Write a protein that binds this ligand. Sequence first.
Ligand code: FE2
Ligand code: FE2
Ligand code: FE2
Ligand code: FE2
Lengths: 174, 174
Amino acid sequence: MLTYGAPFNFPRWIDEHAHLLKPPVGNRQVWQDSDFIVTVVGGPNHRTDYHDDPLEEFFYQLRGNAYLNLWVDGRRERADLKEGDIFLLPPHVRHSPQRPEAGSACLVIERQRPAGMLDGFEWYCDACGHLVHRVEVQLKSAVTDLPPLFESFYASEDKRRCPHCGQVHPGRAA
Amino acid sequence: MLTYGAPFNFPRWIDEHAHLLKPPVGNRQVWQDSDFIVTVVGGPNHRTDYHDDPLEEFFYQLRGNAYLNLWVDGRRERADLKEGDIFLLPPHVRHSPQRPEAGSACLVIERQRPAGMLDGFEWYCDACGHLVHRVEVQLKSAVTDLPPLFESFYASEDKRRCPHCGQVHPGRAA
Ligand SMILES: [Fe+2]
Ligand SMILES: [Fe+2]
Ligand SMILES: [Fe+2]
Ligand SMILES: [Fe+2]
């Protein structure tokens, strides 16, 4: 009845998965088919997408430092995840995590989205701050659901084109 | 829009709350009014109640050692939370956490129960293993909802009386 197995040492698990906690994979989920989505995210990694999570997101930056690019109160903010920091993100706060350091490790906890509760993935214009493109998705497996989403944005100048000032978003790298 | 405040250093937070992570309080919730219930549980503490949580329970034993008394497959099992261990408990697995060490610290993450989804708190007969008493509760604030529940069990020989073999459960301490 211990569907998720017995307790196990977390720092050693992180050490054993260090080759997954770097490009191109970067992150690895701890338990499968659970309501709590428990993930360890490594580095380095940079991204331009902002996530609109309809539920809360918990962060515990166990090793190394990272930071979150955020939209707060209509203003573009930064929240540092220094080593040892914990943080709870409220639903729908747009966030774009940047992880500059190799060997870094962050525990991220989410939970499964019920049917009909959609996740949003957004990009914003560096020139005028307007929203450039949003895709909503019924998230079942981020590891595989999202790479094709991101790739389709990078590949389309039309998706990347700002509707306000016409500036074409750079795509993959800022 | 950062309803739960900015990130902060977790080990230092644990150090600053060490006086709450011991009797009589024992535990302290990190953020209030959040969907994710984030708690740090200290020690020492022993208990005879088993919890029937209708949702999952995540454990990260950061400092010191503890263990969980469990009911697994109709058999009374023990799952050690050695220092550094993480663990995900599936819904409805009956569990009774024992925390023998002072200075220990365990991160426990749950989430709010929707209306109508009840928590159970149970005691079992040491002599024959039968269920002695169960109370169901709409859990809103464990810190204050549950002490009167536990106290009412300790105070009533009738609640503590095993319906199978008549043995009166010892109450507070095993
Ligand atoms: Fe996210
Ligand atoms: Fe623009
Ligand atoms: Fe529990
Ligand atoms: Fe009995």
